[PDB]
Amino acid sequence: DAPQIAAKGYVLMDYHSGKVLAEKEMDTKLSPASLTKMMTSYVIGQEVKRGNISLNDDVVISKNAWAKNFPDSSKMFVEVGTTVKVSDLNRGIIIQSGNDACVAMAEHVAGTEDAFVDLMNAWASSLGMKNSHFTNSHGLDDPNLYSTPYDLALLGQALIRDVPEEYAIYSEQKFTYNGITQYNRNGLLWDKSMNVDGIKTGHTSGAGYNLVSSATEGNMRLVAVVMGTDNENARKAESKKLLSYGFRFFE
Numbered sequence: 281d282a283p284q285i286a287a288k289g290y291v292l293m294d295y296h297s298g299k300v301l302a303e304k305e306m307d308t309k310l311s312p313a314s315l316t317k318m319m320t321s322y323v324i325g326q327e328v329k330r331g332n333i334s335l336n337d338d339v340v341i342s343k344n345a346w347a348k349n350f351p352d353s354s355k356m357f358v359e360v361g362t363t364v365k366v367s368d369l370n371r372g373i374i375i376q377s378g379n380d381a382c383v384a385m386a387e388h389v390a391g392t393e394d395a396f397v398d399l400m401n402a403w404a405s406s407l408g409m410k411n412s413h414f415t416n417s418h419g420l421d422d423p424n425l426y427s428t429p430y431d432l433a434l435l436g437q438a439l440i441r442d443v444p445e446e447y448a449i450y451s452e453q454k455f456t457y458n459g460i461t462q463y464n465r466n467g468l469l470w471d472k473s474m475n476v477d478g479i480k481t482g483h484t485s486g487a488g489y490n491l492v493s494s495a496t497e498g499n500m501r502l503v504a505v506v507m508g509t510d511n512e513n514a515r516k517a518e519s520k521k522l523l524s525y526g527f528r529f530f531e
């Protein structure tokens with residue numbers, strides 16, 4: 281008896297087999313918003329593993345990455361004409377959810393945001409995200425930027441599976457850049473009763489708060505996606521319920 285989850289859509293997936301244990305509106309399209317950053321970090325993770333970029337490179341911060349372009353949204357607080365290290369931009373993306381850092385990495389990886397988006401969709405396709413399409417590296421709204429809870433689950437799973445060095449970064453609780461400290465918004469990282477080590481948080485303006493989470497217990501690993509909860513407390517509680525049910529499902 282799957283429990284009731286106060287969310288517009290969700291999916292709970294066994295990480296090992298990829299089997300869906302429970303779901304609601306699993307394949308219905310939504311605006312993923314800041315969860316789009318998981319795809320950005322996925323592409324960055326592949327580039328780092330293959331050696332096309334190094335964590336020690338100095339990245340140019342262009343006009344397009346200027347903090348000035350992202351008023352009202354989360355930022356790492358990067359400045360034009362300076363350089364920032366790849367590892368630092370990565371954490372800005374993952375921990376701080378900084379849109380500025382997304383654009384800077386996009387450019388460092390593929391020259392322009394558009395080409396970076398080409399790599400994002402080519403990876404989405406090879407991962408089996410058949411109901412997803414990206415238009416930018418950060419998630420700000422666009423009619424053609426969409427995904428689904430199920431696809432987002434595949435993405436979370438792929439992060440843990442294919443880019444572990446990138447995935448480890450999702451359990452870091454905070455990050456400081458330029459004397460500005462920001463916390464990882466995934467509150468489940470602080471829960472002592474559970475071993476939640478990811479993944480990413482976000483908000484979709486007409487729907488609500490979202491969370492893509494993963495946790496382990498014994499030899500089990502689950503990936504859960506909850507979309508459209510009414511507030512940050514519900515985002516945590518409903519994800520925790522979803523996950524506990526999965527741990528109990530295998531019994």
Ligand SMILES: O=N[O-]
Pocket residue numbers: 465466467468481512513515516
């Ligand atoms: O802690 N998640 O809102």
Ligand SMILES: O=N[O-]
Pocket residue numbers: 499500501530
């Ligand atoms: O079969 N152990 O998750």
